[PDB]
Assembly symmetry: C3
Homo-oligomer: 123 residues x 3
């Protein structure tokens, strides 16, 4: 429960996230058309891989999530970090393609990656 | 069972799908060589992400799939939609890179995404 | 256990793998800068998809992994194949982008893909 509770919710978000944004980018791509080209391309793949390792990591301490400890918060903020980070980006075809923005997204993937990873594993 | 039954099968397909097609594209890429360049590149990533969110969504109502309701059919046709959709595409390096074809694939990802997602979640 | 044991470990590796390598490439990309451009781009996506289907396949005989038979070894060497394969590659922006190296990585994905896939499925 506690467990299912966690994963679905994060992912659902995550997947409302990645979902609007995917078809959406598709939809805008053709609609914009071009700068928006990479913009859209761009959203997909950073995010697609935000998710891609989200998926690795979440999905797994998922079904290996024994300890009672509260860790979902990061499942939760890493989402929270990464969304506003893309969203912050968020149209500049010029590099920078990054910023404090992703010092948030990636780097939280990193922190919440790092701890929780190690956590349900070594236990 | 009913459950395992579902996921493996869809994925197996899905993964026979994504699998021939991956090494295959590799194999053809070098063999064609060039137009086939993006063609192959092309197959991977639409499909790679067909799968990528397949994976998100399937995999999860997977292990959160309680209701008796018949929903696998779409696991099943969204595959059925997406394969023939790429396959329909399926060599034009000119945009369009889409069509009624993906009005099928993506959009079923969308429908079968949308309902089943919400379904085992809100329950 | 035996099961959890398996998946986490492979993935952890896999995910220490894909993880250093992702932020890392990011980090080097900006730092190199350019040839390193595709190099880094390059690492991500072969590997990102090494993982991408790893994820499909591992993750699933994962929770459908009944037989006692020893199959983790490949979870294990396919990792072992693929790492040293990228790593072998591993800076040439000239094609070849492949070699005996990936005759290892991909092709083990293939062998260990192929058998274990079929195995916990048909059972
Ligand atoms: C609950 C907390 C108690 C107190 C709350 C009070 C907090 C109030 C914060 C007030 C802030 C004051 C504003 C100063 C900021 C100026 C920033 C700036 O100049 O831009 C930098 C710019 C710099 O831009 P740039 O010029 O480098 O590039 C832009 C791109 N070009 C140039 C191509 C156009 O960086 C960004 O754009 C980042 C975007 C920030 C987006 C912020 C929106 C998200 C905020 C989330 C939190 C909000 C509440 C959610 C709560 C939900 C509740 C559960
Ligand atoms: C943008 C900036 C960068 C962002 C990148 C990523 C984010 C980085 C995160 C960094 C780590 C932050 C550290 C916080 C934790 C440190 C505190 C600590 O250790 O104290 C002990 C811990 C543990 O609790 P305790 O140990 O004090 O309690 C003792 C009770 N016994 C021993 C009997 C069990 O305290 C907490 O952290 C509690 C925090 C709870 C969070 C607040 C919400 C609780 C309510 C739940 C529902 C609320 C709705 C929210 C839903 C959100 C919807 C979107
Ligand atoms: C069981 C049902 C009862 C009745 C079955 C009877 C159904 C019989 C349907 C007969 C159809 C009549 C044909 C008219 C169609 C003409 C289409 C056309 O012109 O092409 C559009 C074209 C338009 O092309 P275009 O010109 O825009 O671009 C092509 C690309 N260039 C130009 C670069 C070369 O679009 C497509 O290519 C789509 C490809 C369609 C592929 C169809 C094969 C898959 C069909 C799956 C179902 C088959 C059975 C599976 C059953 C399994 C059983 C469990
Ligand atoms: C290319 C075009 C776009 C494609 C994109 C994606 C596809 C879009 C899908 C859109 C939705 C379609 C709606 C269909 C459902 C609506 C019907 C409905 O609501 O009625 C009630 C529902 C529910 O059943 P019921 O409620 O009528 O039964 C009552 C019994 N009690 C109450 C006691 C439990 O009926 C059905 O849908 C039954 C359909 C079953 C499907 C037919 C096959 C059954 C046999 C199984 C094995 C067959 C082998 C197949 C293997 C395939 C291999 C590849
Ligand atoms: C335990 C076993 C018992 C015996 C152990 C004894 C084994 C000892 C093997 C000794 C080998 C002798 C060396 C001859 C090889 C020459 C290769 C060559 O020329 O390069 C080809 C080259 C050809 O290069 P190229 O010229 O086509 O392209 C390079 C790119 N450019 C040109 C752009 C610069 O291919 C490679 O680079 C492949 C890289 C190989 C990397 C090997 C390191 C990994 C080895 C893993 C095993 C090690 C132990 C791990 C054990 C862990 C324990 C649990
Ligand atoms: C770079 C080159 C390409 C690489 C690409 C991918 C790799 C390709 C792999 C190809 C397949 C290789 C075939 C090997 C198996 C064939 C042998 C066989 O069938 O015999 C019967 C099998 C089965 O056992 P058995 O059937 O003989 O035992 C009988 C006992 N009863 C019947 C009662 C149950 O034997 C084995 O394979 C045992 C091998 C075990 C592996 C050795 C290690 C065991 C110790 C565990 C801990 C060690 C630490 C290691 C951790 C690693 C850390 C990173
Ligand atoms: N989907 C791509 C995203 C790559 C990307 O957007 N790279 C950014 C940094 S994370 C960059 O600076 N690219 C170089 C460029 O735009 O020229 C991947 O997985 O590699
Ligand atoms: N793998 C790429 C696929 C992108 C792609 O093929 N985009 C299509 C629409 S879905 C397109 O029209 N691209 C613009 C172009 O080809 O110039 C991604 O995930 O973004
Ligand atoms: N992430 C890309 C990787 C594609 C790639 O690196 N292709 C290699 C073979 S696996 C190649 O030879 N590309 C053609 C080129 O570099 O011009 C994908 O998923 O398609
Ligand atoms: C329960 C899991 C939620 C699944 C949503 C999948 C959306 C995919 C985003 C790409
Ligand atoms: C919900 C996530 C929204 C992501 C918006 C990303 C903005 C793109 C910036 C490039
Ligand atoms: C049981 C799951 C089936 C796994 C097949 C994986 C194939 C990967 C396709 C890329
Ligand atoms: C099994 C799926 C086959 C996919 C074929 C895709 C055709 C590519 C069109 C571009
Ligand atoms: C237990 C599973 C291990 C999760 C590590 C995820 C790292 C992601 C790599 C991209
Ligand atoms: C741990 C995996 C390390 C991968 C190194 C890949 C080398 C890139 C070659 C291109």
């Amino acid at each position: 429960n506690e467990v299912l509770m966690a994963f679905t919710s994060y992912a659902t978000i995550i997947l409302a996230k990645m979902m609007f944004l995917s078809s959406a980018t598709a939809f805008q791509r053709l609609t914009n058309k071009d700068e928006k080209v990479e913009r859209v391309r761009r959203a997909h793949l950073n995010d697609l891989e935000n998710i891609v390792p989200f998926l690795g990591i979440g999905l797994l301490y998922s079904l290996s999530g024994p300890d009672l400890s509260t860790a979902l918060i990061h499942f939760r903020i890493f989402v929270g970090a990464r969304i506003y980070h893309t969203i912050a980006y968020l149209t500049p075809l010029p590099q920078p393609n990054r910023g404090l923005a992703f010092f948030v997204g990636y780097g939280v993937t990193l922190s919440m990656a790092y701890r929780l990873l190690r956590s349900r594993l070594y236990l």
